[PDB]
Design a protein around this ligand. Structure first.
Ligand code: 0Z4
Ligand code: CA
Length: 240
């Protein structure tokens, strides 16, 4: 997260760190949202490499014991059938991970609230990006969970010339784009939490920023629109 601030420890209890084995240690690669006690929603491109993956819930500082973490292995990955590795701009950047065991819910580990199917936010809606991703373009991962206020940019403004043009679709949410605050590498897969009828719901799964850099003016962070996939998500948990 560029231009973030340190989140409090109990502010976003549905945030997870998706980690892969790195020699003899584990390294963070992506965020995600805990959506059932044994299911994580993350970005499809985070699970394209055929790595062994770890999910950590109750995580606040990647590099030191918090006394709140629960570590669980991924047992099955379900990427969206339409996702194509070569085309982030086509969309469908979403995957569901079934965990080896159910997590214990407490004030640090909670399920994320999903929107009703079809829900589009109006322009400038209050939203927050969270993650441990790079704090600068071509910089380094944060140690502690960062958060940045990233208001949405609706489809018409985002798919316009000056902004993302045709690269964004209606199955995506854009948010931010002020040139100060943004998602950045390592934040992919994570939540965009937007305030809706007094309740924070997860409306985005972080998917991409500009190739020019993370915090670029009129190039908001682009998220997969969760409410475009509620039937797909329910159908996977239903059969799996
Ligand atoms: C905030 C995160 C989401 C940053 C965002 N990352 C991405 O979209 C890529 C997904 C794979 C793209 C394959 N072309 N994600 C990552 O590499 C990450 F580390 F962040 F997880 C990015 O840099 N977006 C981007 C940059 C370049 C491209 C291609 C034109 C190379 C596509 C997307
Ligand atoms: Ca820790």
């Amino acid at each position: 997260v560029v231009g973030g601030t340190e989140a409090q420890r109990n502010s976003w209890p549905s945030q997870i760190s998706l980690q892969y084995r790195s020699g003899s240690s584990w390294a963070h690669t992506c965020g995600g949202t805990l959506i059932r006690q044994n299911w994580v929603m993350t970005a499809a491109h985070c699970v394209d490499r055929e790595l062994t993956f770890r999910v950590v819930v109750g995580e606040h500082n990647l590099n030191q014991n918090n006394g709140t973490e629960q570590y669980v292995g991924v047992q099955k990955i379900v990427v969206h059938p339409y996702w194509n590795t070569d085309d982030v701009a086509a969309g469908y950047d979403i995957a569901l991970l079934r965990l080896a065991q159910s997590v214990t819910l407490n004030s640090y580990v909670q399920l994320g609230v999903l929107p009703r199917a079809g829900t589009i936010l109006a322009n400038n809606s209050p939203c927050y990006i969270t993650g441990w991703g790079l704090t600068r373009t071509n910089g380094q991962l944060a140690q502690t969970l960062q958060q940045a206020y990233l208001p949405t940019v609706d489809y018409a403004i985002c798919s316009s010339s000056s902004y993302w043009g045709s690269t964004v679709k209606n199955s995506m949410v854009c948010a931010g784009g002020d040139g100060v605050r943004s998602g950045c590498q390592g934040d992919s897969g994570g939540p965009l939490h937007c305030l809706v009828n007094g309740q924070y719901a997860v409306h985005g799964v972080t998917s991409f920023v500009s190739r020019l850099g993370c915090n670029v003016t009129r190039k908001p962070t682009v998220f997969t629109r969760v409410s475009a996939y509620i039937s797909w998500i329910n159908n996977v948990i239903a059969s799996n």
